[PDB]
Design an enzyme around this catalytic site. Structure first.
Site, PDB file in Angstrom:
ATOM      1  N   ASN A  32      17.240  11.768  12.532  1.00 45.90           N
ATOM      2  CA  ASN A  32      16.419  12.937  12.200  1.00 45.90           C
ATOM      3  C   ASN A  32      16.275  13.037  10.686  1.00 45.90           C
ATOM      4  O   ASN A  32      17.253  13.243   9.932  1.00 45.90           O
ATOM      5  CB  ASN A  32      17.052  14.208  12.757  1.00 45.90           C
ATOM      6  CG  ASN A  32      16.156  15.427  12.638  1.00 45.90           C
ATOM      7  OD1 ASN A  32      15.479  15.610  11.624  1.00 45.90           O
ATOM      8  ND2 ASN A  32      16.160  16.262  13.683  1.00 45.90           N
TER       9      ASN A  32
ATOM     10  N   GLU B 220      19.208   6.923   8.621  1.00 45.44           N
ATOM     11  CA  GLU B 220      18.555   8.092   9.184  1.00 45.44           C
ATOM     12  C   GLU B 220      18.236   8.002  10.670  1.00 45.44           C
ATOM     13  O   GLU B 220      17.882   6.943  11.192  1.00 45.44           O
ATOM     14  CB  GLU B 220      17.223   8.323   8.452  1.00 45.44           C
ATOM     15  CG  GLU B 220      17.388   8.756   7.006  1.00 45.44           C
ATOM     16  CD  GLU B 220      17.601  10.259   6.921  1.00 45.44           C
ATOM     17  OE1 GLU B 220      17.327  10.791   5.830  1.00 45.44           O
ATOM     18  OE2 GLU B 220      18.023  10.853   7.935  1.00 45.44           O
TER      19      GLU B 220
ATOM     20  N   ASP C 281       0.698   1.973  19.779  1.00 39.40           N
ATOM     21  CA  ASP C 281       0.496   1.358  18.462  1.00 39.40           C
ATOM     22  C   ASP C 281       1.412   2.011  17.431  1.00 39.40           C
ATOM     23  O   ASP C 281       2.038   3.052  17.699  1.00 39.40           O
ATOM     24  CB  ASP C 281      -0.964   1.512  18.060  1.00 39.40           C
ATOM     25  CG  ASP C 281      -1.539   0.674  16.956  1.00 39.40           C
ATOM     26  OD1 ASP C 281      -0.848  -0.213  16.417  1.00 39.40           O
ATOM     27  OD2 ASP C 281      -2.735   0.950  16.637  1.00 39.40           O
ATOM     28  N   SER C 282       1.424   1.377  16.248  1.00 39.38           N
ATOM     29  CA  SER C 282       1.988   2.074  15.093  1.00 39.38           C
ATOM     30  C   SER C 282       0.877   2.913  14.447  1.00 39.38           C
ATOM     31  O   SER C 282      -0.264   2.890  14.916  1.00 39.38           O
ATOM     32  CB  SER C 282       2.630   1.086  14.147  1.00 39.38           C
ATOM     33  OG  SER C 282       1.703   0.140  13.671  1.00 39.38           O
TER      34      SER C 282
ATOM     35  N   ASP D 175      -0.034  -7.629   1.702  1.00 36.91           N
ATOM     36  CA  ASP D 175       0.435  -6.245   1.729  1.00 36.91           C
ATOM     37  C   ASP D 175       1.961  -6.183   1.892  1.00 36.91           C
ATOM     38  O   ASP D 175       2.480  -5.852   2.955  1.00 36.91           O
ATOM     39  CB  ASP D 175      -0.241  -5.422   2.825  1.00 36.91           C
ATOM     40  CG  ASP D 175       0.041  -3.933   2.746  1.00 36.91           C
ATOM     41  OD1 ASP D 175       0.575  -3.456   1.714  1.00 36.91           O
ATOM     42  OD2 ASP D 175      -0.288  -3.209   3.718  1.00 36.91           O
TER      43      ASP D 175
ATOM     44  N   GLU E  64      23.844   9.194   6.662  1.00 37.09           N
ATOM     45  CA  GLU E  64      22.866   8.790   5.674  1.00 37.09           C
ATOM     46  C   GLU E  64      23.464   8.260   4.382  1.00 37.09           C
ATOM     47  O   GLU E  64      24.561   8.584   3.922  1.00 37.09           O
ATOM     48  CB  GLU E  64      21.983   9.991   5.288  1.00 37.09           C
ATOM     49  CG  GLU E  64      21.225  10.587   6.444  1.00 37.09           C
ATOM     50  CD  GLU E  64      21.937  11.715   7.164  1.00 37.09           C
ATOM     51  OE1 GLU E  64      23.156  11.899   6.941  1.00 37.09           O
ATOM     52  OE2 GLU E  64      21.233  12.413   7.948  1.00 37.09           O
TER      53      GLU E  64
ATOM     54  N   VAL F 122      17.190  16.610   8.965  1.00 36.76           N
ATOM     55  CA  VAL F 122      18.521  17.175   9.115  1.00 36.76           C
ATOM     56  C   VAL F 122      19.548  16.160   8.623  1.00 36.76           C
ATOM     57  O   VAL F 122      19.500  14.990   9.042  1.00 36.76           O
ATOM     58  CB  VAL F 122      18.843  17.505  10.576  1.00 36.76           C
ATOM     59  CG1 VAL F 122      20.280  17.995  10.694  1.00 36.76           C
ATOM     60  CG2 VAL F 122      17.848  18.522  11.099  1.00 36.76           C
TER      61      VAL F 122
ATOM     62  N   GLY G 247       4.615   0.296   6.216  1.00 33.27           N
ATOM     63  CA  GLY G 247       5.687  -0.284   5.432  1.00 33.27           C
ATOM     64  C   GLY G 247       6.916  -0.638   6.253  1.00 33.27           C
ATOM     65  O   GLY G 247       7.740  -1.399   5.728  1.00 33.27           O
TER      66      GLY G 247
ATOM     67  N   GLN H  76      -0.136   5.749  10.702  1.00 32.87           N
ATOM     68  CA  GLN H  76       0.288   6.107   9.343  1.00 32.87           C
ATOM     69  C   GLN H  76       1.624   6.843   9.367  1.00 32.87           C
ATOM     70  O   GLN H  76       1.886   7.594  10.308  1.00 32.87           O
ATOM     71  CB  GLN H  76      -0.771   6.966   8.635  1.00 32.87           C
ATOM     72  CG  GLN H  76      -1.996   6.180   8.135  1.00 32.87           C
ATOM     73  CD  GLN H  76      -3.207   6.451   9.016  1.00 32.87           C
ATOM     74  OE1 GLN H  76      -3.073   6.342  10.237  1.00 32.87           O
ATOM     75  NE2 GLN H  76      -4.350   6.810   8.443  1.00 32.87           N
ATOM     76  N   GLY H  77       2.431   6.563   8.357  1.00 34.92           N
ATOM     77  CA  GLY H  77       3.800   7.048   8.283  1.00 34.92           C
ATOM     78  C   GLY H  77       4.799   6.032   8.811  1.00 34.92           C
ATOM     79  O   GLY H  77       5.961   6.041   8.404  1.00 34.92           O
TER      80      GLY H  77
ATOM     81  N   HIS I 273       0.825  -1.208   0.000  1.00 32.95           N
ATOM     82  CA  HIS I 273       0.000   0.000   0.000  1.00 32.95           C
ATOM     83  C   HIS I 273       0.858   1.257   0.000  1.00 32.95           C
ATOM     84  O   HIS I 273       0.338   2.357  -0.227  1.00 32.95           O
ATOM     85  CB  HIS I 273      -1.000   0.000   1.140  1.00 32.95           C
ATOM     86  CG  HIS I 273      -0.545   0.436   2.495  1.00 32.95           C
ATOM     87  ND1 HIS I 273      -0.190  -0.463   3.463  1.00 32.95           N
ATOM     88  CD2 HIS I 273      -0.397   1.663   3.040  1.00 32.95           C
ATOM     89  CE1 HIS I 273       0.161   0.186   4.547  1.00 32.95           C
ATOM     90  NE2 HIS I 273       0.044   1.492   4.341  1.00 32.95           N
TER      91      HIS I 273
END
Ligand code: BRV
Ligand code: CA
Ligand code: CL
Length: 223
Positions: free
Chosen positions: A54, A52, A171-172, A84, A62, A57, A178, A174-175, A40
């Site tokens: 932050n 990553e 909980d987890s 999914d 990274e 920044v 995945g 949105q964002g 999704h």
């Protein structure tokens, strides 16, 4: 992640951010050239961001690598969120180090009551929205089949499991979508869906990665 804690910089070194001009989903590095995420989360123009903490920044550890290919599970159904899962191939191999590291695929499915680590840069409120800059973490157990199916009647397939807290507040969200659910050092879940975030009797629902390892192995062997 609602009700969780600050992980600590690069303590979850398989955690990736998927960026299409902004952070929109998590993922998990499973080898130097491949990320597992949610179907999704599919879109064109993905850049994978490794190492990553932050996300707003540049802190110095990274690696930003564009995706060459996204592969949605052949049987993904966006209506039910059955199957999914997606693979993302990187245009170049990541340089693996203490802060950028792969997570192993399961050889056995995880057990009810196992304590897992869920992580991401998703919403931290249960109602309204607040999006963190640094990576957030939550410890949560895998719930019984009985409890998962009673929470979401007629919607839980054998390719899903529940994890979290029936009482609410952790909980987890949105964002985080995945991103990883790691249990005993293996990637056992992908953040997939739920009703709201951190609601009483509505735990998180996670893609059951152990059901997909054959497809994963065969797909990465040929791409
Ligand atoms: N210690 C341990 C446990 Br507990 C479980 C489990 O949840 O049943 C699994 Br699937 C593994 C594994 O990853 O093989 C391991 Br190692
Ligand atoms: Ca950064
Ligand atoms: Cl049941």
């Amino acid at each position: 992640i609602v009700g969780g804690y600050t992980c600590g910089a690069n303590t979850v070194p398989y955690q990736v951010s998927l960026n299409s001009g902004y952070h929109f989903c998590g993922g998990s590095l499973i080898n130097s050239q491949w990320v597992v995420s949610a179907a999704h989360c599919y879109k064109s123009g993905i850049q994978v961001r490794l190492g990553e903490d932050n996300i707003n920044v540049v802190e110095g550890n990274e690696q930003f690598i564009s995706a060459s290919k996204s592969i949605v599970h052949p049987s993904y159904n966006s209506n039910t969120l059955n199957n999914d899962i997606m693979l993302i191939k990187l245009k170049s191999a990541a340089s693996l180090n203490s802060r950028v590291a792969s997570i192993s695929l399961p050889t056995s499915c995880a057990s009810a009551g196992t304590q897992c680590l869920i992580s991401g840069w998703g919403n931290t409120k249960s109602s309204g929205t607040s999006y963190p800059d640094v990576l957030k973490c939550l410890k949560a157990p895998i719930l019984s089949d009985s409890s998962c199916k009673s929470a979401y009647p007629g919607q839980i397939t054998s390719n899903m499991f529940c994890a979290g807290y029936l009482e609410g507040g952790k909980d987890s969200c949105q964002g985080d979508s995945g991103g990883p659910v790691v249990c005993s050092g293996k990637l056992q879940g992908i953040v997939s869906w739920g009703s709201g975030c951190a609601q009483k009797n509505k735990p998180g629902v996670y893609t059951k990665v152990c059901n997909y390892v054959s497809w994963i192995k065969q797909t990465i062997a040929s791409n």
